[PDB]
Amino acid sequence: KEIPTPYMWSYQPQMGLAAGAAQDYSTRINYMSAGPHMISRVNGIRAHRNRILLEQAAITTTPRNNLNPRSWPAALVYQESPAPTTVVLPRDAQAEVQMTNSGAQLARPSFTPRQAILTLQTSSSEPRSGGIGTLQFIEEFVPSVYFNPFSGPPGHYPDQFIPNFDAVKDS
Amino acid sequence: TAVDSITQKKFLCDRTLWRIPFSSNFMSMGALTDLGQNLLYANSAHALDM
Amino acid sequence: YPIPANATNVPISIPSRNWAAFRGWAFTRLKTKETPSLGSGYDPYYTYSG
C-alpha cells in the first residue's frame, strides 16, 4: 500500500500484444532502513519517480481502456510510409508496332520521342490490424504503477495484469 | 482337419507420416492452431521431459 | 548450471524479470572437482586443493 514497485509489461513479439506487468527486483535497492535521516530520501526519490512514470503514461499513450486488445486498429501505432516514386520507360507502348513483324528488327528513345507516365500509390492496401508490427511497443504501453495493491476484491482488480491471461475470460 | 490355433494381430504402417493436430479439439486448421496459441500456451520457456 | 560428459546442448532458463542495469555478458569455464557450488563453510564436495 505504501511501498510498491513500478510495474513492467512482459512481451511476446510476433503476437504484438504484451503478456502482463511485473515488479522489478534485480536492481531494487536495499530496504534495510538506513536511519531516520535517510528513510525520507529512499521513500522520497522513489516518490518523484512514481510521478515521472505516471505523467508520461498519459502523454506517450492515451489512458487505458482495453488494457490488452489483440483486435487492435491503428491510430497512434503507425502505418508504414505512403510515398511512391515512378519512372518512365526507354521504349514506347505504341511506337513499336510499325517495325519488327514488317521487316525492321528492333534491338528520349531517339527514334520517335514521347512522354507518358502513370503513378500509383505505395500504401498498405487496407489499414494495419492485429498486434504491433515493427517497433511501437514502448509508445503503446508505458510502465505504469498501481500504488494500492488489489484495493477492491470482488468488483475489479488488476485484470489484464496477469501474463497467464486472455481478453475473453479471466482465469 | 482340426489343429487348435490362436490369431496374432500385428499391423503395418508404410510411408505414412505420423500426423497429429496440436489442439484440445484435435483439429489441424489454420496457422494459429486451437491449443497452439490459446490462454497460457504462448507462455514462456518451461522444461520438457517426455 | 552443471553439465554432463560428452554433451553439447545447454541454454539458460530465465523468463520475464527485472533488467535495469546491464553492461553485457561474460563467460568462462571451471571444474566441479576443484571448487563446488559455494555458500557453505565446508561442504561435501571439496577434494582437490589445486
PDB file of C-alpha atoms in Angstrom:
ATOM      1  CA  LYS A   1       0.000   0.000   0.000  1.00  0.00           C
ATOM      2  CA  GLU A   2       2.858   2.366   0.916  1.00  0.00           C
ATOM      3  CA  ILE A   3       5.941   0.981  -0.904  1.00  0.00           C
ATOM      4  CA  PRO A   4       5.158  -0.804  -4.210  1.00  0.00           C
ATOM      5  CA  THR A   5       7.376  -1.073  -7.320  1.00  0.00           C
ATOM      6  CA  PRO A   6       6.506   0.389 -10.769  1.00  0.00           C
ATOM      7  CA  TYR A   7       5.003  -2.444 -12.841  1.00  0.00           C
ATOM      8  CA  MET A   8       6.774  -3.562 -16.040  1.00  0.00           C
ATOM      9  CA  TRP A   9       4.974  -5.115 -19.041  1.00  0.00           C
ATOM     10  CA  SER A  10       6.278  -8.503 -20.275  1.00  0.00           C
ATOM     11  CA  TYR A  11       6.399  -9.019 -24.049  1.00  0.00           C
ATOM     12  CA  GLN A  12       5.726 -11.510 -26.839  1.00  0.00           C
ATOM     13  CA  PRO A  13       6.916 -10.050 -30.164  1.00  0.00           C
ATOM     14  CA  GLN A  14       5.146 -11.853 -33.142  1.00  0.00           C
ATOM     15  CA  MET A  15       1.804 -11.672 -31.400  1.00  0.00           C
ATOM     16  CA  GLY A  16       2.262  -7.967 -30.905  1.00  0.00           C
ATOM     17  CA  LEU A  17       0.351  -7.913 -27.610  1.00  0.00           C
ATOM     18  CA  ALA A  18       2.076  -7.730 -24.210  1.00  0.00           C
ATOM     19  CA  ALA A  19       1.549 -10.623 -21.769  1.00  0.00           C
ATOM     20  CA  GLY A  20       1.314  -8.675 -18.479  1.00  0.00           C
ATOM     21  CA  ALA A  21       3.009  -6.398 -15.936  1.00  0.00           C
ATOM     22  CA  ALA A  22       5.530  -7.428 -13.227  1.00  0.00           C
ATOM     23  CA  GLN A  23       7.623  -5.786 -10.459  1.00  0.00           C
ATOM     24  CA  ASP A  24      11.389  -5.041 -10.571  1.00  0.00           C
ATOM     25  CA  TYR A  25      13.888  -6.720  -8.196  1.00  0.00           C
ATOM     26  CA  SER A  26      17.328  -7.382  -9.775  1.00  0.00           C
ATOM     27  CA  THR A  27      18.098  -3.623  -9.468  1.00  0.00           C
ATOM     28  CA  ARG A  28      15.808  -2.812  -6.491  1.00  0.00           C
ATOM     29  CA  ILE A  29      17.796  -1.025  -3.741  1.00  0.00           C
ATOM     30  CA  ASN A  30      18.272  -2.164  -0.100  1.00  0.00           C
ATOM     31  CA  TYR A  31      15.181  -1.696   2.100  1.00  0.00           C
ATOM     32  CA  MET A  32      17.073  -2.267   5.354  1.00  0.00           C
ATOM     33  CA  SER A  33      16.198   1.206   6.675  1.00  0.00           C
ATOM     34  CA  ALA A  34      19.436   3.207   6.970  1.00  0.00           C
ATOM     35  CA  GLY A  35      18.109   5.560   9.671  1.00  0.00           C
ATOM     36  CA  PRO A  36      15.708   8.495  10.333  1.00  0.00           C
ATOM     37  CA  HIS A  37      17.933  10.757   8.176  1.00  0.00           C
ATOM     38  CA  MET A  38      17.728   8.601   5.004  1.00  0.00           C
ATOM     39  CA  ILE A  39      14.303   6.864   5.275  1.00  0.00           C
ATOM     40  CA  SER A  40      12.649  10.038   3.900  1.00  0.00           C
ATOM     41  CA  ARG A  41      15.131  10.007   0.978  1.00  0.00           C
ATOM     42  CA  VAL A  42      14.641   6.349  -0.100  1.00  0.00           C
ATOM     43  CA  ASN A  43      10.857   6.924   0.073  1.00  0.00           C
ATOM     44  CA  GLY A  44      11.221  10.429  -1.455  1.00  0.00           C
ATOM     45  CA  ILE A  45      13.429   9.863  -4.533  1.00  0.00           C
ATOM     46  CA  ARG A  46      11.107   6.955  -5.452  1.00  0.00           C
ATOM     47  CA  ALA A  47       8.040   9.203  -4.889  1.00  0.00           C
ATOM     48  CA  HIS A  48       9.003  11.692  -7.627  1.00  0.00           C
ATOM     49  CA  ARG A  49       9.853   8.745  -9.933  1.00  0.00           C
ATOM     50  CA  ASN A  50       6.306   7.447  -9.304  1.00  0.00           C
ATOM     51  CA  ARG A  51       5.100  10.764 -10.777  1.00  0.00           C
ATOM     52  CA  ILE A  52       7.690  10.563 -13.606  1.00  0.00           C
ATOM     53  CA  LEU A  53       6.158   7.249 -14.794  1.00  0.00           C
ATOM     54  CA  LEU A  54       2.592   8.491 -14.067  1.00  0.00           C
ATOM     55  CA  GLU A  55       2.745  11.749 -16.085  1.00  0.00           C
ATOM     56  CA  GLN A  56       4.343  10.215 -19.213  1.00  0.00           C
ATOM     57  CA  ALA A  57       1.744   7.381 -19.186  1.00  0.00           C
ATOM     58  CA  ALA A  58      -0.970   9.879 -20.229  1.00  0.00           C
ATOM     59  CA  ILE A  59       1.379  11.719 -22.644  1.00  0.00           C
ATOM     60  CA  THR A  60       3.040   8.801 -24.523  1.00  0.00           C
ATOM     61  CA  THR A  61      -0.286   6.943 -24.936  1.00  0.00           C
ATOM     62  CA  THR A  62      -3.998   7.713 -24.464  1.00  0.00           C
ATOM     63  CA  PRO A  63      -5.200   6.479 -20.986  1.00  0.00           C
ATOM     64  CA  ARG A  64      -6.076   2.776 -20.562  1.00  0.00           C
ATOM     65  CA  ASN A  65      -9.436   1.496 -21.851  1.00  0.00           C
ATOM     66  CA  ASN A  66      -8.965  -2.049 -23.156  1.00  0.00           C
ATOM     67  CA  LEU A  67      -5.833  -2.927 -21.159  1.00  0.00           C
ATOM     68  CA  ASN A  68      -4.676  -5.622 -23.626  1.00  0.00           C
ATOM     69  CA  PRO A  69      -6.519  -5.764 -27.007  1.00  0.00           C
ATOM     70  CA  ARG A  70      -5.399  -8.228 -29.718  1.00  0.00           C
ATOM     71  CA  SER A  71      -8.018  -6.895 -32.166  1.00  0.00           C
ATOM     72  CA  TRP A  72      -6.181  -3.580 -32.457  1.00  0.00           C
ATOM     73  CA  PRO A  73      -6.723  -0.746 -35.009  1.00  0.00           C
ATOM     74  CA  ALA A  74      -4.078   1.833 -35.996  1.00  0.00           C
ATOM     75  CA  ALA A  75      -4.231   5.421 -34.678  1.00  0.00           C
ATOM     76  CA  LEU A  76      -1.147   6.048 -32.506  1.00  0.00           C
ATOM     77  CA  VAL A  77       0.541   2.872 -33.814  1.00  0.00           C
ATOM     78  CA  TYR A  78       1.927   3.974 -37.181  1.00  0.00           C
ATOM     79  CA  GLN A  79       1.065   2.578 -40.625  1.00  0.00           C
ATOM     80  CA  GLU A  80       4.209   2.434 -42.816  1.00  0.00           C
ATOM     81  CA  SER A  81       5.242   5.144 -45.335  1.00  0.00           C
ATOM     82  CA  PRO A  82       2.831   6.043 -48.209  1.00  0.00           C
ATOM     83  CA  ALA A  83       5.033   7.553 -50.975  1.00  0.00           C
ATOM     84  CA  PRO A  84       5.713   6.087 -54.471  1.00  0.00           C
ATOM     85  CA  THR A  85       8.469   7.015 -56.955  1.00  0.00           C
ATOM     86  CA  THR A  86       7.550   6.427 -60.618  1.00  0.00           C
ATOM     87  CA  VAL A  87       9.961   6.390 -63.589  1.00  0.00           C
ATOM     88  CA  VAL A  88       9.474   6.204 -67.391  1.00  0.00           C
ATOM     89  CA  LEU A  89      10.433   3.514 -69.931  1.00  0.00           C
ATOM     90  CA  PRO A  90      13.265   3.549 -72.540  1.00  0.00           C
ATOM     91  CA  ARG A  91      10.797   2.172 -75.139  1.00  0.00           C
ATOM     92  CA  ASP A  92       7.254   3.331 -76.003  1.00  0.00           C
ATOM     93  CA  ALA A  93       3.924   1.450 -75.823  1.00  0.00           C
ATOM     94  CA  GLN A  94       2.636   2.304 -79.327  1.00  0.00           C
ATOM     95  CA  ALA A  95       5.817   3.167 -81.295  1.00  0.00           C
ATOM     96  CA  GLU A  96       6.928  -0.498 -81.603  1.00  0.00           C
ATOM     97  CA  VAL A  97       4.112  -1.981 -83.768  1.00  0.00           C
ATOM     98  CA  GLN A  98       5.463  -0.458 -87.022  1.00  0.00           C
ATOM     99  CA  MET A  99       8.739  -2.363 -87.426  1.00  0.00           C
ATOM    100  CA  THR A 100       9.638  -5.923 -86.245  1.00  0.00           C
ATOM    101  CA  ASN A 101       6.897  -8.031 -87.912  1.00  0.00           C
ATOM    102  CA  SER A 102       7.113  -5.946 -91.113  1.00  0.00           C
ATOM    103  CA  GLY A 103      10.905  -6.096 -91.648  1.00  0.00           C
ATOM    104  CA  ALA A 104      12.971  -3.721 -89.489  1.00  0.00           C
ATOM    105  CA  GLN A 105      14.191  -5.576 -86.369  1.00  0.00           C
ATOM    106  CA  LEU A 106      14.496  -3.735 -83.032  1.00  0.00           C
ATOM    107  CA  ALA A 107      17.453  -4.306 -80.691  1.00  0.00           C
ATOM    108  CA  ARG A 108      14.058  10.112 -75.360  1.00  0.00           C
ATOM    109  CA  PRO A 109      14.243   6.759 -77.244  1.00  0.00           C
ATOM    110  CA  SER A 110      15.997   8.527 -80.191  1.00  0.00           C
ATOM    111  CA  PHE A 111      13.570   7.068 -82.785  1.00  0.00           C
ATOM    112  CA  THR A 112      10.275   8.890 -82.070  1.00  0.00           C
ATOM    113  CA  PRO A 113      10.120  10.749 -78.683  1.00  0.00           C
ATOM    114  CA  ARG A 114       7.035  10.588 -76.413  1.00  0.00           C
ATOM    115  CA  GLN A 115       6.212  11.462 -72.777  1.00  0.00           C
ATOM    116  CA  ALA A 116       3.746   9.180 -70.930  1.00  0.00           C
ATOM    117  CA  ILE A 117       3.875   8.155 -67.235  1.00  0.00           C
ATOM    118  CA  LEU A 118       1.335   6.845 -64.688  1.00  0.00           C
ATOM    119  CA  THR A 119       1.779   6.935 -60.890  1.00  0.00           C
ATOM    120  CA  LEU A 120       0.046   4.565 -58.434  1.00  0.00           C
ATOM    121  CA  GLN A 121       0.109   4.575 -54.599  1.00  0.00           C
ATOM    122  CA  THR A 122       2.538   2.576 -52.413  1.00  0.00           C
ATOM    123  CA  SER A 123       0.498   2.419 -49.147  1.00  0.00           C
ATOM    124  CA  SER A 124      -0.647  -0.744 -47.322  1.00  0.00           C
ATOM    125  CA  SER A 125      -3.755  -1.871 -49.267  1.00  0.00           C
ATOM    126  CA  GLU A 126      -6.039  -1.690 -46.201  1.00  0.00           C
ATOM    127  CA  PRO A 127      -5.249  -0.338 -42.648  1.00  0.00           C
ATOM    128  CA  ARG A 128      -2.967  -2.055 -40.096  1.00  0.00           C
ATOM    129  CA  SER A 129      -4.709  -4.681 -37.939  1.00  0.00           C
ATOM    130  CA  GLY A 130      -3.751  -7.037 -35.091  1.00  0.00           C
ATOM    131  CA  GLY A 131      -0.675  -6.629 -32.883  1.00  0.00           C
ATOM    132  CA  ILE A 132       2.284  -4.233 -33.125  1.00  0.00           C
ATOM    133  CA  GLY A 133       4.406  -4.883 -36.238  1.00  0.00           C
ATOM    134  CA  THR A 134       7.946  -3.482 -36.089  1.00  0.00           C
ATOM    135  CA  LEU A 135       8.733  -1.253 -33.048  1.00  0.00           C
ATOM    136  CA  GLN A 136       5.857   0.638 -31.351  1.00  0.00           C
ATOM    137  CA  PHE A 137       5.743  -1.265 -28.017  1.00  0.00           C
ATOM    138  CA  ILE A 138       7.076   1.423 -25.613  1.00  0.00           C
ATOM    139  CA  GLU A 139       4.794   4.079 -27.151  1.00  0.00           C
ATOM    140  CA  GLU A 140       1.739   1.824 -26.637  1.00  0.00           C
ATOM    141  CA  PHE A 141       2.064   0.640 -23.010  1.00  0.00           C
ATOM    142  CA  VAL A 142       4.461   2.681 -20.856  1.00  0.00           C
ATOM    143  CA  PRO A 143       5.446   1.155 -17.450  1.00  0.00           C
ATOM    144  CA  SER A 144       2.732   2.332 -15.050  1.00  0.00           C
ATOM    145  CA  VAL A 145       2.087   1.943 -11.313  1.00  0.00           C
ATOM    146  CA  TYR A 146      -0.853   0.684  -9.262  1.00  0.00           C
ATOM    147  CA  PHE A 147       0.177   2.127  -5.891  1.00  0.00           C
ATOM    148  CA  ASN A 148      -2.549   0.385  -3.830  1.00  0.00           C
ATOM    149  CA  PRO A 149      -2.263  -3.427  -4.463  1.00  0.00           C
ATOM    150  CA  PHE A 150      -5.662  -5.159  -5.008  1.00  0.00           C
ATOM    151  CA  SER A 151      -7.642  -2.433  -3.194  1.00  0.00           C
ATOM    152  CA  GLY A 152     -11.109  -3.756  -4.066  1.00  0.00           C
ATOM    153  CA  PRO A 153     -11.573  -7.578  -4.021  1.00  0.00           C
ATOM    154  CA  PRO A 154     -14.803  -8.637  -5.827  1.00  0.00           C
ATOM    155  CA  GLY A 155     -15.615  -5.775  -8.266  1.00  0.00           C
ATOM    156  CA  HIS A 156     -12.382  -5.297 -10.210  1.00  0.00           C
ATOM    157  CA  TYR A 157      -8.639  -5.822  -9.714  1.00  0.00           C
ATOM    158  CA  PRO A 158      -5.569  -5.577 -11.998  1.00  0.00           C
ATOM    159  CA  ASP A 159      -7.170  -7.759 -14.721  1.00  0.00           C
ATOM    160  CA  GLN A 160      -5.009  -7.986 -17.899  1.00  0.00           C
ATOM    161  CA  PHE A 161      -2.042  -7.559 -15.495  1.00  0.00           C
ATOM    162  CA  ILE A 162      -1.503 -11.356 -15.430  1.00  0.00           C
ATOM    163  CA  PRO A 163       0.695 -12.959 -18.169  1.00  0.00           C
ATOM    164  CA  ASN A 164      -1.446 -16.140 -17.929  1.00  0.00           C
ATOM    165  CA  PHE A 165      -4.427 -14.190 -19.295  1.00  0.00           C
ATOM    166  CA  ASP A 166      -6.534 -13.604 -22.414  1.00  0.00           C
ATOM    167  CA  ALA A 167      -9.134 -10.862 -23.054  1.00  0.00           C
ATOM    168  CA  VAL A 168     -12.055 -13.330 -23.472  1.00  0.00           C
ATOM    169  CA  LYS A 169     -12.233 -14.769 -19.922  1.00  0.00           C
ATOM    170  CA  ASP A 170     -10.472 -14.399 -16.578  1.00  0.00           C
ATOM    171  CA  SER A 171      -8.568 -17.417 -15.188  1.00  0.00           C
TER     172      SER A 171
ATOM    173  CA  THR B   1      -8.723 -81.173 -40.221  1.00  0.00           C
ATOM    174  CA  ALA B   2      -8.622 -79.910 -36.605  1.00  0.00           C
ATOM    175  CA  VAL B   3      -5.428 -78.371 -35.152  1.00  0.00           C
ATOM    176  CA  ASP B   4      -6.131 -75.741 -32.441  1.00  0.00           C
ATOM    177  CA  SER B   5      -4.738 -72.247 -33.186  1.00  0.00           C
ATOM    178  CA  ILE B   6      -4.687 -68.616 -31.918  1.00  0.00           C
ATOM    179  CA  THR B   7      -4.612 -65.496 -34.160  1.00  0.00           C
ATOM    180  CA  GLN B   8      -1.898 -62.808 -33.903  1.00  0.00           C
ATOM    181  CA  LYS B   9      -2.934 -59.240 -34.821  1.00  0.00           C
ATOM    182  CA  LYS B  10       0.028 -57.064 -35.914  1.00  0.00           C
ATOM    183  CA  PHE B  11      -0.458 -54.012 -38.172  1.00  0.00           C
ATOM    184  CA  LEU B  12       1.665 -52.426 -40.924  1.00  0.00           C
ATOM    185  CA  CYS B  13       2.271 -48.697 -41.471  1.00  0.00           C
ATOM    186  CA  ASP B  14       4.178 -47.837 -44.848  1.00  0.00           C
ATOM    187  CA  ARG B  15       5.290 -44.393 -45.911  1.00  0.00           C
ATOM    188  CA  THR B  16       2.621 -42.912 -43.743  1.00  0.00           C
ATOM    189  CA  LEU B  17       3.574 -39.845 -41.786  1.00  0.00           C
ATOM    190  CA  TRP B  18       2.682 -39.874 -38.055  1.00  0.00           C
ATOM    191  CA  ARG B  19       0.191 -36.984 -38.133  1.00  0.00           C
ATOM    192  CA  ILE B  20      -1.221 -35.191 -35.086  1.00  0.00           C
ATOM    193  CA  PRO B  21      -3.001 -31.787 -34.644  1.00  0.00           C
ATOM    194  CA  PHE B  22      -1.761 -29.531 -31.815  1.00  0.00           C
ATOM    195  CA  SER B  23      -5.261 -28.934 -30.416  1.00  0.00           C
ATOM    196  CA  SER B  24      -7.544 -29.761 -27.482  1.00  0.00           C
ATOM    197  CA  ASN B  25     -10.224 -30.079 -30.181  1.00  0.00           C
ATOM    198  CA  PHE B  26      -7.730 -32.226 -32.209  1.00  0.00           C
ATOM    199  CA  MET B  27      -8.214 -30.218 -35.435  1.00  0.00           C
ATOM    200  CA  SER B  28      -5.495 -29.182 -37.895  1.00  0.00           C
ATOM    201  CA  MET B  29      -6.957 -25.920 -39.236  1.00  0.00           C
ATOM    202  CA  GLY B  30      -5.039 -22.654 -39.739  1.00  0.00           C
ATOM    203  CA  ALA B  31      -1.556 -21.476 -38.728  1.00  0.00           C
ATOM    204  CA  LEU B  32      -2.786 -20.247 -35.324  1.00  0.00           C
ATOM    205  CA  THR B  33      -3.807 -23.684 -34.003  1.00  0.00           C
ATOM    206  CA  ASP B  34      -6.645 -24.173 -31.464  1.00  0.00           C
ATOM    207  CA  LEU B  35      -4.392 -25.023 -28.472  1.00  0.00           C
ATOM    208  CA  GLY B  36      -1.080 -23.886 -30.041  1.00  0.00           C
ATOM    209  CA  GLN B  37      -1.837 -20.225 -29.290  1.00  0.00           C
ATOM    210  CA  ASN B  38      -4.533 -20.117 -26.580  1.00  0.00           C
ATOM    211  CA  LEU B  39      -4.862 -18.756 -22.989  1.00  0.00           C
ATOM    212  CA  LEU B  40      -1.495 -19.807 -21.491  1.00  0.00           C
ATOM    213  CA  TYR B  41       0.120 -21.812 -24.326  1.00  0.00           C
ATOM    214  CA  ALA B  42       2.123 -18.948 -25.862  1.00  0.00           C
ATOM    215  CA  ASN B  43       3.732 -18.904 -22.379  1.00  0.00           C
ATOM    216  CA  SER B  44       7.465 -18.548 -21.544  1.00  0.00           C
ATOM    217  CA  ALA B  45      10.164 -21.277 -21.560  1.00  0.00           C
ATOM    218  CA  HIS B  46       9.316 -24.305 -19.392  1.00  0.00           C
ATOM    219  CA  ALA B  47      11.180 -27.637 -19.108  1.00  0.00           C
ATOM    220  CA  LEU B  48      10.062 -30.570 -21.282  1.00  0.00           C
ATOM    221  CA  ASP B  49      10.571 -34.248 -20.376  1.00  0.00           C
ATOM    222  CA  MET B  50       8.884 -36.993 -22.434  1.00  0.00           C
TER     223      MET B  50
ATOM    224  CA  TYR C   1      24.496 -24.605 -14.223  1.00  0.00           C
ATOM    225  CA  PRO C   2      26.101 -28.273 -14.064  1.00  0.00           C
ATOM    226  CA  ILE C   3      26.627 -30.045 -17.411  1.00  0.00           C
ATOM    227  CA  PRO C   4      27.435 -33.821 -18.058  1.00  0.00           C
ATOM    228  CA  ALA C   5      30.117 -35.601 -20.085  1.00  0.00           C
ATOM    229  CA  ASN C   6      30.086 -35.593 -23.992  1.00  0.00           C
ATOM    230  CA  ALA C   7      27.037 -33.223 -24.333  1.00  0.00           C
ATOM    231  CA  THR C   8      26.834 -30.005 -26.383  1.00  0.00           C
ATOM    232  CA  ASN C   9      23.332 -28.552 -25.754  1.00  0.00           C
ATOM    233  CA  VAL C  10      22.695 -26.278 -22.731  1.00  0.00           C
ATOM    234  CA  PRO C  11      20.807 -22.915 -22.551  1.00  0.00           C
ATOM    235  CA  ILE C  12      19.896 -20.555 -19.661  1.00  0.00           C
ATOM    236  CA  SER C  13      16.324 -20.868 -18.347  1.00  0.00           C
ATOM    237  CA  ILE C  14      15.161 -17.460 -17.054  1.00  0.00           C
ATOM    238  CA  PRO C  15      11.779 -15.891 -18.008  1.00  0.00           C
ATOM    239  CA  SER C  16      10.378 -12.342 -17.567  1.00  0.00           C
ATOM    240  CA  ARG C  17      12.076 -10.404 -14.743  1.00  0.00           C
ATOM    241  CA  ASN C  18      13.897  -7.127 -13.981  1.00  0.00           C
ATOM    242  CA  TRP C  19      16.695  -5.774 -16.141  1.00  0.00           C
ATOM    243  CA  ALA C  20      17.521  -2.121 -15.374  1.00  0.00           C
ATOM    244  CA  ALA C  21      21.326  -2.265 -15.097  1.00  0.00           C
ATOM    245  CA  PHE C  22      23.357  -4.201 -17.694  1.00  0.00           C
ATOM    246  CA  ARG C  23      26.794  -3.664 -19.287  1.00  0.00           C
ATOM    247  CA  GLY C  24      26.765  -7.083 -21.012  1.00  0.00           C
ATOM    248  CA  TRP C  25      27.747 -10.764 -20.879  1.00  0.00           C
ATOM    249  CA  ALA C  26      30.784 -12.680 -19.564  1.00  0.00           C
ATOM    250  CA  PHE C  27      31.624 -16.417 -19.545  1.00  0.00           C
ATOM    251  CA  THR C  28      34.472 -18.773 -18.592  1.00  0.00           C
ATOM    252  CA  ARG C  29      34.908 -22.467 -17.654  1.00  0.00           C
ATOM    253  CA  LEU C  30      35.681 -24.255 -14.365  1.00  0.00           C
ATOM    254  CA  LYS C  31      35.749 -27.832 -12.980  1.00  0.00           C
ATOM    255  CA  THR C  32      33.217 -29.192 -10.465  1.00  0.00           C
ATOM    256  CA  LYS C  33      36.009 -31.149  -8.708  1.00  0.00           C
ATOM    257  CA  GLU C  34      38.353 -28.246  -7.775  1.00  0.00           C
ATOM    258  CA  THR C  35      35.594 -25.936  -6.472  1.00  0.00           C
ATOM    259  CA  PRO C  36      31.851 -26.614  -5.849  1.00  0.00           C
ATOM    260  CA  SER C  37      28.668 -24.510  -5.642  1.00  0.00           C
ATOM    261  CA  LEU C  38      29.726 -22.113  -2.857  1.00  0.00           C
ATOM    262  CA  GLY C  39      27.685 -20.639   0.012  1.00  0.00           C
ATOM    263  CA  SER C  40      28.713 -23.065   2.775  1.00  0.00           C
ATOM    264  CA  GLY C  41      31.686 -23.330   5.183  1.00  0.00           C
ATOM    265  CA  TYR C  42      32.938 -26.834   4.387  1.00  0.00           C
ATOM    266  CA  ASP C  43      30.529 -28.600   2.006  1.00  0.00           C
ATOM    267  CA  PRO C  44      30.667 -32.388   0.963  1.00  0.00           C
ATOM    268  CA  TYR C  45      32.352 -31.564  -2.305  1.00  0.00           C
ATOM    269  CA  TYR C  46      35.786 -30.400  -1.731  1.00  0.00           C
ATOM    270  CA  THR C  47      38.629 -32.866  -2.745  1.00  0.00           C
ATOM    271  CA  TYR C  48      41.103 -31.009  -4.989  1.00  0.00           C
ATOM    272  CA  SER C  49      43.120 -28.454  -3.353  1.00  0.00           C
ATOM    273  CA  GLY C  50      44.815 -27.316  -6.635  1.00  0.00           C
TER     274      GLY C  50
END
